[PDB]
Each structure stands twice: as C-alpha cells, then as structure tokens.
Design a protein around this ligand. Structure first.
Ligand SMILES: CC(C)C1=CC2=CC(=O)[C@H]3C(C)(C)CCC[C@]3(C)C2=C(O)C1=O
Ligand SMILES: CC(C)C1=CC2=CC(=O)[C@H]3C(C)(C)CCC[C@]3(C)C2=C(O)C1=O
Ligand SMILES: O=P(O)(O)C(O)(Cn1ccnc1)P(=O)(O)O
Ligand SMILES: O=P(O)(O)C(O)(Cn1ccnc1)P(=O)(O)O
Ligand SMILES: [Mg+2]
Ligand SMILES: [Mg+2]
Ligand SMILES: [Mg+2]
Ligand SMILES: [Mg+2]
Ligand SMILES: [Mg+2]
Ligand SMILES: [Mg+2]
Lengths: 346, 346
C-alpha cells in the first residue's frame, strides 16, 4: 500500500543516482571506460528486485519527520540513502552469487555468469560498495547525521560479512556433517547475514535522518527488526526449494551447496534414524537424482506445512514485539514493512 | 635506514591489532568461529611483505609531529593507522590474486588457492576491508582527524577499484588487441590502481594525524607521490617477468593474462612490423612455449636495458619534484620512501 504507491517515484530517481555517479569524474576523462563499466554494473545489479529495503528508508522517513520539515532537498537525501541501501544489497548479492555458485538472480543470469565478466565481478562488487559512500558525501556531507550514517553502513557491512563467514564455514563443499546444523547455529547465521542489513539498517537510517539517535530507541527498533529479519531468511530458505523460479527470479542451490537452511534443521529435528541416513548420503551434492531425494524426504515430513505453521506463529510474535517496543515510533513503520513480507512468494 | 629500524616495532604491534579485532566480539560468542576465521585470514594475508606502506605512516608521523606531542597513545594510533593501510593492501591483493589467476604471493600459495578456501576468499577480503574501519573507530574515534581518515581510506579504495576496472577492461581473456596498449592508457591505469593507495594514502594519513590538512599541502604531496607510484608500478611490471620469484615471492602472469604491462607498451613502441606479429600471435595466452617467445622478443629489444635507463631518469625527476614541492614538509619524508623503492628486487 504505502510501499506500492512510492515504488514508481523511487525507481525514477535511479537515473539521477547514475548520472551523479557517472559525471563528477568526467573532467577525469582518462577513467571514462571504467565509469562506463560502472554505469553498466549499476544497471544490471541495482535494478529488478522489489526495492523493499530502499523503500523502507523513504517510507519510514515520511512517517517520522513532520511534513513542514520535508523540504525537497530532504526528500532527495531520503531516497538517495534509500538507494545506498539497495547498493549494499547489490554489493553482497553479486558476491554471494559467486560464492553460492548460483545461476540466476532477479530472473536473469547472475552477473558473474555473463560471458565477459566472471570473476571481474569481484571488483565490480567492491565498486558498488564504494558508491554508497560517494553518494553519502554528495548528498549528506553537511548533515549532522553524516557520520552516524557512514558508521551504520560500515557496521552493517561488517556484520553481514561476519554472517557470510558463518554461512560458508557451516557449509564446506564435500563435507557432510549434519551435526553442525542446529537451531543455535541457524539463528546466529541469519541474524548476522540478513537481519542487520535488511531490517535494522534501513529503518535506523531513517531514524538518524529524522534526528532520532538515542541508544534506547535504536535498541528497541532493533529488537523488532532482528526478529523480522530472522523470519525473512527462513522464508528465503523455504522459497529456495519450494518456490517458483519464475516468481523468485532465482534457481535454488542450498542442498547442493551443503547449506544450513531452515529446512535441513527442521528435517533433522524430525528425522527417524533411517531418514538421517538418506539425508546423510544425498545432501551437499550436485547430482539432481540426490537433490530430489532430499526434497521428497522434506515433503514426506510435511515441512511445507511446518513452514506455514511457523510463518503464522512468528508473525504473531513479531506483532507482540511491535506492541511492546514500537513506542514512541508510529507502529505503521513496522506494520507496513511486515505486511510487505507476509506470505511473499518472491 | 629509518624504515629498517622501525620494522620490528611495527611488526610486534600486529599481535595487539589481532587481539583487539578478535576480542570485542567475544561477548558475542555465537560468532566465535567467524572470528577465528578472521584471525586466520589476517595472519595469512597481512603478514609476509615488506610493510613499506604501513611503515610510511609511522615514519612520516615521527617526522612531522614535535616529539613533545608524541605521547604513547599518539604513537599507538600512528601504527594502528599504519596497519589499516596494510589491511587495505591485503584486501586488494587477495581479490587481485583471484582476478589475475595468480599462484603465489609473498612466497606462499595465494589464499584462494589454498585447499578449503577458494572463492570464500571473496568474503575474506571484504572482512579485511571492514577491519580498517573497526580499528579507526577503536583508536581514532575521538580525534579531530577521524572523519578525514575515514573519507581518505574510502576515496583511496574507490580510486584503486576504478583503476582495477581499467586494468581488467584493457585485458580481456582471449582478445588480443595490442592497439589498446598505449602510454596514455598505461599511465592512467597505474595512477588509479597503485599510486593513490600505495603512495598518497599513507603519507596523507600521517599529514592529517599531525594536523596538516590544507588542500595545497596535500595537492603538492600528491604531485610527488603519484609520480613515485607510477615508477613503482613499472618496477612491478618489470619484476613480473624478469624477477626472481624466490625474491619477489610471486610468479608472474602478465603476458598470460593479456595485461597492459609497461614492457608490452615499450615493446610496441620499438617493434618492427614482423615483431608486431610474433607479439600478436603469442600474447595473452597460457602456453609456456608462447610466453617464452614474448620474453625473447623483449630481450631482443634490450628492454631490461630500457628499464634500467627509465629507472634512472624517473628517479631524477622524482627528486626534482621533491626539490619543487616538498616545502614546508621535511624532504626526508619523501627521500626515505624513495630510497626504500630504488632498485628494489622484491
Ligand atoms: C534491490 C531490491 C529490489 C531488493 C531486491 C531483492 C531481490 C532479490 O532477489 C531478493 C531475494 C533473491 C529473494 C533475496 C532476499 C530479498 C531480495 C534480496 C531482494 C531485496 O531484499 C531487495 O531489497
Ligand atoms: C604488506 C606490506 C608488507 C606490503 C607487502 C607487499 C608485498 C608484496 O607482495 C608486494 C608486491 C607483490 C611486489 C606488489 C607491490 C609491493 C607489495 C604489494 C607489497 C607492499 O607494497 C606492502 O606494503
Ligand atoms: O540464501 P542466501 O543467504 O545466499 C541469499 O538469501 C542472499 N543473502 C546473502 C546474505 N543474506 C542473504 P539468496 O538466497 O538471495 O542467495
Ligand atoms: O600487477 P598487479 O597490478 O596485479 C599487482 O601489482 C597488484 N596490484 C593491484 C593493484 N595495484 C597493484 P601484483 O603484481 O602484486 O599482482
Ligand atoms: Mg549465501
Ligand atoms: Mg545465494
Ligand atoms: Mg537462499
Ligand atoms: Mg592486477
Ligand atoms: Mg596480480
Ligand atoms: Mg604485477
């Protein structure tokens, strides 16, 4: 609703993002070809998703500043920082697609699987990360929140990299240990790898933009948002296997790449001993034969019904946390973001 | 001399760097394995080189602050920022070794070629980059230069990524165009990919640490240091082919990876037309047979004698630039860094 009306405005602002990033080194014409490559990197990897995270920055911002303080410049900043969050996303996704050996993202081939790119994508990603800070300096250099935003984006990146490290250490290629795949470990992975940057970051960004910068307001926002981000990742794990790749826009890899997916942890909690072994023999391997066997087992234990149950209970809990911890923020802030991830299928 | 006496102190401070980076998330014990991996990432990829860049921060700092203002805390900061520069280096090298398909660095196997790492190295690198800003916040958060340093490290990274993009666009795998490989293009590549982060960054860091933060002092320092960094990269290109991999610590790749090396640009300036074709047919290809042919041609045109000539003339020019542009800084700042790269063989 609030997200859906703002989408178009938000996407239209991308042209200016590109312009500003591609122009103020063109009285450096010697780098001209690099800057053309940047343009192309941005167009391929910032565009095509739902924009929930960047929209969250613009929406929350609208809802937390008095309209008499929403001058045009201030809006311009709000959706720039919006776009900075989308660039962080793009950054991590381009890298994650290489490290997960994935094939599609957003219903096209992964950047690194393009003829002519491959592992050059690595530097492409680092550039996307640099652009965040280019924009902040351009649009927010003279705001009193400038340094708060810089430190927030850096800390959210560190946290997601710590989470990525955990994600990959728990999933060595060619090493089935199923013993690694616990609830403690899962909860911990998803907190760091998804929950800070996809839920805390954008809302916290708009908080500092509206001058709301006390530790306790942030901590309380955080309690809500880390839990929403956990749920979001479990959805992601479910959709990796049971989703339509024409709706998700991406082909699943989690069983192949030996991942601590939510599904495998649930599986392990339910599995008879004979089931344990079918999973042991078939998991973390690239053979389609063997992946299909894992899925059939998951289906055998009604884990799609267990997902649909978990979704229901988690949503109630998130809502309790909003009742508890939203004040003095408008609940609409959290509710609107919850409604936009409830029962999502991309 | 000044570098050589400070090395030991500087290296000894690494233990504390690691300690500080591995401890203040251990009342977050859930990430404990990620933090162990960080430790290991740091030990493998920050240690084993010459430390010229980090030593440059400590040396310049000593030479620009009055001793009565070199309290123990201030030194501690100076070699922390020293180590931040070495981490930026580590960051780029781990990524560069993957994108250049290299085999050895610092006389051991490239991190990504370790059994158990490969392309996980990508996130390993991003973590090294995050640590820079972790340390800055730890040690320099309350200094008036804090934000100058943050912006300098970010801008130097953007610039080196722009340079990397140029480096790889000029060297597509399986596309010999020799026409791309000009002086304009080379000079431009090396400015961005090496010269900002290896020469400007460390000295500029110590300038802002000593309260010397005017545009014109920086611009003048920069004129000297961009030119030293150009020379340094040409050395690097020469050593890639004509150096001892037991002294350099790394096996060359530039002809294989189709690079705009200084040698190939020189070659092209000298080559008869029949020579042009031997180069055309043999360059940018992985066959040892064909690489040897390129080297023999370079040798045929006395390019090691042309290198040794260029080294001589460039050094005179750098020294002229110091005579011109050092003031009011002590010339020792520039001289000491020049002496430590003159006629280097690693
Ligand atoms: C960039 C913005 C549109 C945006 C795009 C998203 C695209 C994706 O492919 C989504 C998944 C693949 C389902 C992974 C989680 C959600 C993703 C990452 C997604 C965003 O969160 C997002 O803000
Ligand atoms: C980390 C610090 C010791 C340091 C190490 C270096 C190690 C290298 O391998 C050097 C080359 C491979 C010759 C590439 C240029 C110089 C290198 C990068 C180098 C440093 O500059 C450096 O500060
Ligand atoms: O499953 P992942 O964590 O790789 C993923 O959700 C991306 N991601 C990466 C870090 N946090 C989320 P995607 O499924 O989009 O590939
Ligand atoms: O030759 P490159 O630029 O790849 C190199 O010098 C590293 N580098 C990367 C950017 N600047 C310098 P190395 O020869 O160490 O591999
Ligand atoms: Mg992943
Ligand atoms: Mg993935
Ligand atoms: Mg997934
Ligand atoms: Mg390179
Ligand atoms: Mg290299
Ligand atoms: Mg080289």
């Amino acid at each position: 609703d609030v997200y859906a009306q703002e989408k178009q405005d938000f996407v239209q602002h991308f042209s200016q993002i590109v312009r500003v990033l591609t122009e103020d080194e063109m009285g450096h014409p010697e780098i001209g070809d690099a800057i053309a490559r940047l343009k192309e990197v941005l167009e391929y990897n910032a565009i095509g998703g739902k924009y929930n995270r960047g929209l969250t920055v613009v929406v929350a911002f609208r809802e937390l500043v008095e309209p008499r303080k929403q001058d045009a410049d201030s809006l311009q900043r709000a959706w720039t920082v919006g776009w900075c969050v989308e660039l962080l996303q793009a950054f991590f996704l381009v890298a994650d697609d290489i490290m997960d050996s994935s094939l599609t993202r957003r219903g096209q081939i992964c950047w690194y699987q393009k003829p002519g790119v491959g592992l050059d994508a690595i530097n492409d990603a680092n550039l996307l990360e640099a652009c965040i800070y280019r924009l902040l300096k351009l649009y927010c250099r003279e705001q009193p929140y400038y340094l708060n935003l810089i430190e927030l984006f850096l800390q959210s990146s560190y946290q997601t990299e710590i989470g990525q490290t955990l994600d990959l250490l728990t999933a060595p290629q060619g090493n089935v240990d199923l013993v690694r795949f616990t609830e403690k470990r899962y909860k911990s992975i998803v907190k760091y790898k998804t929950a800070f940057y996809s839920f805390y970051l954008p809302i916290a960004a708009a908080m500092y933009m509206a001058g709301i910068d006390g530790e306790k307001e942030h901590a309380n926002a955080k309690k809500i948002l880390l839990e929403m981000g956990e749920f979001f990742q479990i959805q992601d794990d479910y959709l990796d296997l049971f989703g339509d790749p024409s709706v998700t826009g991406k082909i699943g890899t989690d069983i192949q790449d030996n991942k601590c997916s939510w599904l495998v942890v649930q599986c392990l909690q339910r599995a008879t001993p004979e089931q344990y072994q079918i999973l042991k023999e078939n998991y973390g391997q690239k053979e389609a034969e063997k992946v299909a066997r894992v899925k059939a087992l998951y289906e055998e234990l009604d884990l799609p019904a267990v997902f649909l149950q978990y979704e229901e209970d988690s949503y109630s809990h998130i809502m309790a946390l909003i009742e508890q911890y939203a004040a003095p923020l408008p609940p609409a802030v959290f509710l609107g973001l919850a409604r936009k991830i409830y029962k999502r299928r991309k």
